[PDB]
């Protein structure tokens with residue numbers, strides 16, 4: 001979407017994966033979907049280095065809506081958002097952050113909240129703009145294929161017509177099998193800043209793997225359509241939550257990074273461990289994710305040892321390499337060379353291990369190297385020529 | 388097996404899961420299957436509380452064998468075990484520990500090392516007893532069903548004839564699909580102290596779930612056959628390794644405990660975290676696993692919320708409850724009462740949370756309680772009547 005926004009993948013925090021549709025504030029005031037939840041998270045983002053590292057979006061997901069007023073204007077839940085959305089947006093803006101919101105192109109949101117039907121698209125768009133929202137996620141529950149085909153471009157137009165730059169996250173392709181011919185990626189690139197291609201992430205390694213495997217199976221189609229202003233969205237980061245081990249947490253961060261994926265956290269930032277913070281706030285990882293060229297990486301190698309190699313092209317002739325172990329036994333000594341990974345010329349490279357910080361110099365195409373990769377884990381290299 | 392051994396499930400360390408068939412001592416001297424590895428693990432068990440908590444078995448798995456000598460006598464790898472097995476048994480005994488070893492009822496071990504064929508059963512048994520081995524895992528690769536049917540009873544008899552008490556772990560059922568009509572569990576209980584029913588565990592939550600699932604689907608068969616001296620064996624604990632998150636690690640521990648499974652670690656005790664050690668060395672957890680009655684627990688409840696409840700009967704009218712979340716979203720507030728979990732009327736109960744140590748008291752059948760369970764995690768209660 002040619003709206004000046006998201007020339008790099010969006011970084012921030014989204015409520016859904018960790019906090020879901022928890023509306024029971026009476027029994028659970030600290031974790032329910034409420035203005036308090038968002039204000040506290042915003043505070044964490046401002047104070048704990050998140051915003052300074054590039055995590056700027058703070059996104060409301062489903063279950064925020066109270067209803068529509070006498071004029072049909074959406075309103076938040078009065079008990080859970082007492083000061084209103086404009087107040088929240090102001091708060092978020094004052095901390096140097098951006099506010100995202102959620103709506104559904106259909107009769108209802110997936111959790112049954114008032115939907116943005118075709119005749120409400122313009123009104124809701126104007127409402128979000130008036131509120132000074134910075135990002136919209138438009139879901140596609142309770143709609144027909146025809147309604148989505150009309151509705152998603154309708155919202156893009158409506159958002160444009162408001163004059164406010166609003167990042168546009170489209171769930172459209174996820175409701176269509178995510179593939180051509182049903183999905184027209186050329187159109188999506190023109191109307192959206194990013195799109196959910198595939199299934200919702202759940203807090204498990206199995207879920208991460210199923211998403212990865214789908215993106216890799218269809219990378220010939222998906223890799224080229226991504227770039228500055230228009231991204232594939234494989235869904236939220238799970239880092240900080242319950243389902244992933246340490247190795248798996250580091251793996252998702254690395255793999256979402258080579259895929260030029262959004263870096264959208266969904267975890268309790270109030271109680272997040274230093275170890276998980278270290279993953280998410282890795283300065284080199286973020287630099288690679290935010291690379292100005294915006295070229296989505298690819299799986300370039302799969303071996304019978306169940307070691308996979310991913311590669312992402314970067315600016316200044318640099319590359320990102322992710323050595324990924326799908327093994328479930330023990331650490332594995334992966335022996336390779338840059339020549340075997342389709343690097344050419346007589347260029348002498350140097351690599352920095354993204355997690356350990358170690359530097360490997362004197363890497364020519366023929367130079368044999370070993371990386372030790374842990375089960376369900378990664379070794380990641382930032383690779384560059386030296387002279 | 389009526390040899391006076393394993394009246395409670397065996398506790399210890401088994402090499403396989405973590406260290407597999409690593410024989411590269413030149414490149415990897417710290418982690419290869421070697422005399423050194425077993426002594427170092429034994430030192431850790433002696434010095435780090437493991438022995439004191441009841442972990443007494445240090446078990447060699449596959450890839451130890453060097454060959455057979457001129458008399459057909461089994462020999463360890465002379466390079467990796469330069470002092471031989473008696474040296475290792477003697478070392479381990481001097482630390483108040485017991486030594487386990489591995490053989491295969493078939494032409495070869497699963498990794499292709501010399502097998503204990505039918506004509507070698509008696510000789511190898513005598514060798515192991517002479518070495519002062521305390522436990523044997525008899526694997527079943529590269530054999531026919533009839534060879535196993537002769538071989539397993541033959542080995543039990545041959546071990547007995549040595550006069551040395553040797554705990555007998557039988558992989559027999561795992562090669563026969565683990566179920567009736569092919570597996571006769573009354574037979575197994577007579578000839579074995581424990582048996583591997585099912586698939587090799589791998590370092591993943593998927594693996595743990597598939598094993599759990601199989602054991603739960605067939606609990607009507609499997610639960611009654613377990614008892615003092617004869618245990619079901621769902622395979623090694625993954626706690627301390629790569630594939631399990633903290634919640635999942637606590638879950639496997641709790642679930643193996645309600646299943647009256649062996650507590651056989653397979654992890655690097657040299658580098659094990661405090662947090663993983665705390666799981667494995669939990670005194671109440673061990674007490675429950677080692678309950679003198681040896682009654683295998685059952686899954687008693689499965690809600691559409693994907694909360695499962697397991698119950699294990701214990702001595703002194705006590706019980707173990709495991710509330711297990713198969714959810715992959717967020718913490719869940721599970722609402723229940725002991726009456727809903729089919730407990731006896733008019734009795735007042737008290738429960739200690741096995742992980743937090745908290746005591747919930749004054750629980751009648753009708754008393755509503757709430758337990759907060761994390762995704763892929765558990766809450767575990769030690770429950771008892773109070774006067």
Ligand SMILES: *[C@@H]1O[C@H](CO)[C@@H](O[C@@H]2O[C@H](CO)[C@@H](O[C@@H]3O[C@H](CO[C@H]4O[C@H](CO)[C@@H](O)[C@H](O)[C@@H]4O)[C@@H](O)[C@H](O[C@H]4O[C@H](CO)[C@@H](O)[C@H](O)[C@@H]4O)[C@@H]3O)[C@H](O)[C@H]2NC(C)=O)[C@H](O)[C@H]1NC(C)=O
Pocket residue numbers: 002003004159160161162163164165166
């Ligand atoms: C509604 O929809 C329209 C599209 O139909 C959007 O209009 C586009 O807005 C974007 C963002 O503001 C414009 O992109 C920017 O153009 C700037 C100037 O380019 C002009 O000059 C060239 C001459 O070759 C023309 O071809 C072109 O049409 C423009 O008239 C650039 O300076 C900007 O560059 C950015 O990137 C560089 C990195 O290389 C940075 O250094 C800069 O700082 C800067 O960020 C940028 O490319 C685009 O021109 C508009 N398109 C059209 C067709 O008009 C509206 O934004 C949209 N409205 C809303 C609110 O959504």
Ligand SMILES: *[C@@H]1O[C@H](CO)[C@@H](O[C@@H]2O[C@H](CO)[C@@H](O[C@@H]3O[C@H](CO[C@H]4O[C@H](CO)[C@@H](O)[C@H](O)[C@@H]4O)[C@@H](O)[C@H](O[C@H]4O[C@H](CO)[C@@H](O)[C@H](O)[C@@H]4O)[C@@H]3O)[C@H](O)[C@H]2NC(C)=O)[C@H](O)[C@H]1NC(C)=O
Pocket residue numbers: 389390391546547548549550551552553
């Ligand atoms: C090789 O194989 C032989 C034969 O199978 C094994 O010998 C058996 O060893 C077990 C375990 O030590 C013995 O079981 C125990 O017997 C005790 C006394 O039983 C006597 O009375 C019975 C008849 O009632 C006779 O069969 C027997 O000969 C004895 O004279 C019991 O008191 C023990 O009870 C245990 O359980 C009870 C309740 O369940 C508890 O209250 C106790 O605490 C206690 O733990 C137990 O049952 C068995 O008697 C032996 N059988 C025979 C035929 O000799 C060898 O041990 C084995 N050797 C090696 C090296 O592997």
Ligand SMILES: *[C@@H]1O[C@H](CO[C@@H]2O[C@@H](C)[C@@H](O)[C@@H](O)[C@@H]2O)[C@@H](O[C@@H]2O[C@H](CO)[C@@H](O[C@@H]3O[C@H](CO)[C@@H](O)[C@H](O)[C@@H]3O)[C@H](O)[C@H]2NC(C)=O)[C@H](O)[C@H]1NC(C)=O
Pocket residue numbers: 494529530531
């Ligand atoms: C367990 O091991 C026995 C013993 O034989 C041993 O293992 C074999 C694989 C060979 O490496 C032998 O040198 C070794 O002593 C196995 O029985 C033997 O199997 C082999 C291989 O199939 C038989 O040879 C074959 O004979 C047929 C028919 O004539 C030919 O078509 C083949 O080309 C080949 O020569 C051999 O006759 C047989 N020996 C005896 C005495 O039975 C057995 O296969 C193995 N079992 C299991 C469960 O794997």
Ligand SMILES: *[C@@H]1O[C@H](CO[C@@H]2O[C@@H](C)[C@@H](O)[C@@H](O)[C@@H]2O)[C@@H](O[C@@H]2O[C@H](CO)[C@@H](O)[C@H](O)[C@H]2NC(C)=O)[C@H](O)[C@H]1NC(C)=O
Pocket residue numbers: 107142143144
């Ligand atoms: C999206 O909703 C529309 C609106 O109709 C609603 O649902 C009806 C079943 C009923 O509860 C109305 O009061 C609601 O307003 C659906 O369009 C209707 O479809 C039904 C078939 O079930 C048909 O009988 C009606 O004539 C339709 N309404 C009109 C006047 O257009 C639509 O089906 C919903 N989309 C989906 C598939 O979820």
Ligand SMILES: CC(=O)N[C@@H]1[C@@H](O)[C@@H](O)[C@@H](CO)O[C@@H]1O
Pocket residue numbers: 016061062109110111138139140171174196198200
């Ligand atoms: C594809 C898509 O947007 N998926 C969303 C998910 O991310 C979340 O927003 C949920 C809330 O009810 O509704 C959908 O399933």
Ligand SMILES: CC(=O)N[C@@H]1[C@@H](O)[C@@H](O)[C@@H](CO)O[C@@H]1O
Pocket residue numbers: 403448449496497498525526527558561562583585587
């Ligand atoms: C069922 C069974 O015993 N499984 C074993 C496994 O536990 C391990 O010992 C391996 C060694 O090569 O051989 C088999 O797969």
Ligand SMILES: *[C@@H]1O[C@H](CO)[C@@H](O)[C@H](O)[C@H]1NC(C)=O
Pocket residue numbers: 366367368
């Ligand atoms: C890389 O290692 C292999 C051994 O597996 C060796 O044959 C080869 O010569 C090495 N490559 C170079 C150029 O050193």
Ligand SMILES: *[C@@H]1O[C@H](CO)[C@@H](O)[C@H](O)[C@H]1NC(C)=O
Pocket residue numbers: 753754755
């Ligand atoms: C337990 O809670 C339920 C509501 O879930 C309530 O209806 C019931 O009366 C309660 N039982 C007791 C004895 O408190």
